[PDB]
Amino acid sequence: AEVLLQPDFNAEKFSGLWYVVSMASDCRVFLGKKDHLSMSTRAIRPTEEGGLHVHMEFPNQVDAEYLKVGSEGHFRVPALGYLDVRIVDTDYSSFAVLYIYKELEGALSTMVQLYSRTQDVSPQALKSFQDFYPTLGLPKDMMVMLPQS
Protein backbone atom coordinates (compact mmCIF):
# COMPACT_ATOMS: atom_id res chain seq x y z
CA ALA A 1 0.00 0.00 0.00
CA GLU A 2 2.94 2.36 -1.02
CA VAL A 3 2.51 6.17 -0.47
CA LEU A 4 5.02 7.84 -2.81
CA LEU A 5 5.49 11.64 -2.88
CA GLN A 6 4.89 13.32 -6.11
CA PRO A 7 8.41 14.24 -7.40
CA ASP A 8 9.73 17.83 -7.72
CA PHE A 9 7.08 19.25 -5.36
CA ASN A 10 6.83 23.01 -5.89
CA ALA A 11 5.54 24.90 -2.81
CA GLU A 12 5.09 28.14 -4.82
CA LYS A 13 2.78 26.44 -7.36
CA PHE A 14 0.92 24.70 -4.47
CA SER A 15 0.19 28.07 -2.78
CA GLY A 16 -3.16 29.87 -2.97
CA LEU A 17 -6.70 28.70 -2.21
CA TRP A 18 -7.88 25.10 -2.10
CA TYR A 19 -11.15 23.45 -1.02
CA VAL A 20 -11.19 20.19 0.91
CA VAL A 21 -13.89 18.38 -1.13
CA SER A 22 -13.40 14.69 -0.15
CA MET A 23 -11.90 12.78 2.83
CA ALA A 24 -11.26 9.13 3.75
CA SER A 25 -9.95 7.98 7.14
CA ASP A 26 -9.96 5.20 9.73
CA CYS A 27 -9.92 7.88 12.53
CA ARG A 28 -12.89 6.93 14.83
CA VAL A 29 -13.47 10.68 15.59
CA PHE A 30 -13.75 11.47 11.85
CA LEU A 31 -15.99 8.42 11.26
CA GLY A 32 -18.38 9.62 14.02
CA LYS A 33 -18.83 13.13 12.49
CA LYS A 34 -18.27 12.17 8.74
CA ASP A 35 -21.86 13.07 7.60
CA HIS A 36 -21.93 16.34 9.68
CA LEU A 37 -18.75 17.77 8.03
CA SER A 38 -18.78 20.41 5.26
CA MET A 39 -16.30 21.57 2.65
CA SER A 40 -13.60 23.85 4.13
CA THR A 41 -10.77 25.97 2.73
CA ARG A 42 -6.95 25.84 2.90
CA ALA A 43 -5.23 29.11 1.86
CA ILE A 44 -1.53 28.48 1.50
CA ARG A 45 1.63 30.56 1.35
CA PRO A 46 5.18 29.18 1.11
CA THR A 47 7.58 29.70 3.96
CA GLU A 48 11.38 29.56 4.36
CA GLU A 49 12.94 26.04 4.52
CA GLY A 50 10.35 24.63 2.08
CA GLY A 51 7.38 24.68 4.45
CA LEU A 52 3.82 25.96 4.08
CA HIS A 53 1.72 28.33 6.15
CA VAL A 54 -1.88 27.18 5.90
CA HIS A 55 -4.85 29.43 6.77
CA MET A 56 -7.77 26.98 7.37
CA GLU A 57 -11.39 28.21 7.37
CA PHE A 58 -14.44 26.12 8.38
CA PRO A 59 -17.70 27.94 7.38
CA ASN A 60 -13.71 29.06 12.77
CA GLN A 61 -10.17 29.94 11.55
CA VAL A 62 -7.09 27.80 12.33
CA ASP A 63 -3.57 28.48 11.12
CA ALA A 64 -1.06 25.66 10.78
CA GLU A 65 2.64 25.53 9.85
CA TYR A 66 3.52 22.54 7.61
CA LEU A 67 7.16 21.84 8.38
CA LYS A 68 9.35 20.17 5.78
CA VAL A 69 10.51 16.65 6.68
CA GLY A 70 12.54 14.39 4.28
CA SER A 71 12.04 16.29 1.02
CA GLU A 72 9.82 18.81 -0.70
CA GLY A 73 6.12 17.95 -0.31
CA HIS A 74 6.76 15.85 2.88
CA PHE A 75 5.60 17.62 6.03
CA ARG A 76 4.75 17.37 9.74
CA VAL A 77 2.17 19.62 11.40
CA PRO A 78 2.64 19.69 15.20
CA ALA A 79 -0.29 22.18 15.59
CA LEU A 80 -2.71 19.53 14.17
CA GLY A 81 -0.98 16.36 15.41
CA TYR A 82 -0.03 15.34 11.85
CA LEU A 83 3.10 13.18 12.14
CA ASP A 84 3.57 12.71 8.39
CA VAL A 85 1.91 14.49 5.44
CA ARG A 86 2.71 13.59 1.81
CA ILE A 87 1.48 15.43 -1.31
CA VAL A 88 0.77 12.25 -3.31
CA ASP A 89 -0.51 13.77 -6.55
CA THR A 90 -1.23 17.27 -7.78
CA ASP A 91 -1.50 19.14 -11.04
CA TYR A 92 -1.29 22.46 -9.00
CA SER A 93 -4.08 24.07 -11.13
CA SER A 94 -7.12 21.87 -10.22
CA PHE A 95 -6.48 19.22 -7.48
CA ALA A 96 -4.21 17.58 -4.93
CA VAL A 97 -4.33 14.32 -3.01
CA LEU A 98 -2.83 14.46 0.50
CA TYR A 99 -1.80 11.52 2.66
CA ILE A 100 -1.79 12.13 6.42
CA TYR A 101 -0.62 9.94 9.32
CA LYS A 102 -1.78 11.52 12.57
CA GLU A 103 -2.08 11.24 16.33
CA LEU A 104 -5.25 12.30 18.23
CA GLU A 105 -5.46 11.76 22.02
CA GLY A 106 -3.04 8.81 21.63
CA ALA A 107 -4.84 7.19 18.63
CA LEU A 108 -2.84 6.83 15.39
CA SER A 109 -4.81 6.96 12.15
CA THR A 110 -4.55 7.44 8.39
CA MET A 111 -6.32 10.17 6.50
CA VAL A 112 -6.60 11.06 2.82
CA GLN A 113 -7.84 14.44 1.67
CA LEU A 114 -8.82 15.66 -1.78
CA TYR A 115 -8.07 19.34 -2.41
CA SER A 116 -9.74 21.14 -5.34
CA ARG A 117 -9.00 24.68 -6.64
CA THR A 118 -12.82 25.26 -6.65
CA GLN A 119 -15.92 23.81 -4.88
CA ASP A 120 -16.54 21.54 -7.90
CA VAL A 121 -14.51 18.33 -8.09
CA SER A 122 -13.39 17.48 -11.64
CA PRO A 123 -13.70 13.82 -12.76
CA GLN A 124 -9.81 13.75 -12.94
CA ALA A 125 -9.57 14.97 -9.31
CA LEU A 126 -12.15 12.38 -8.17
CA LYS A 127 -10.47 9.55 -10.15
CA SER A 128 -7.02 10.26 -8.55
CA PHE A 129 -8.59 10.25 -5.04
CA GLN A 130 -10.89 7.16 -5.59
CA ASP A 131 -8.02 5.13 -7.14
CA PHE A 132 -5.71 6.06 -4.23
CA TYR A 133 -7.58 5.77 -0.82
CA PRO A 134 -8.58 1.99 -1.27
CA THR A 135 -4.87 1.12 -1.87
CA LEU A 136 -4.40 2.12 1.86
CA GLY A 137 -7.00 -0.43 3.06
CA LEU A 138 -9.67 2.28 3.51
CA PRO A 139 -13.12 1.05 2.36
CA LYS A 140 -15.76 3.31 0.69
CA ASP A 141 -17.75 3.38 4.01
CA MET A 142 -14.79 5.42 5.45
CA MET A 143 -15.05 8.02 2.63
CA VAL A 144 -17.20 11.20 2.47
CA MET A 145 -17.94 13.67 -0.33
CA LEU A 146 -18.13 17.02 1.44
CA PRO A 147 -21.13 19.27 0.73
CA GLN A 148 -20.87 23.10 0.60
CA SER A 149 -21.72 24.77 3.99
Domains of the chain: 1-149 (2.40.128.20)
In this structure, how many other beta carbons lie within 10 angstroms of the beta carbon of residue 100?
Answer: 21
Query: In 3D, which of 38, 6, 5 has the Cα closest to residue 19?
Result: 38
Sign, CA dihedral 129-64-119-15, equals negative
The angle subtended at Cα 68 by Cα 83 and Cα 27, nearest 5°, is 25
Helix (H) or strand (E) holding 77: strand 74-77
Q: Alpha-carbon distance 41 to 19, whole Å?
A: 5
Sign, CA dihedral 66-22-89-98, equals positive
Would you say 69 and 51 are in contact if contact means Cβ atoms under 8 Å apart?
no
Would you say 115 and 83 are in contact if contact means Cβ atoms under 8 Å apart?
no
Q: Alpha-carbon distance 120 to 148, whole Å?
A: 10
Q: Say whether 35 sits in a helix, a strand or coil.
A: helix
| Method for this entry | X-ray
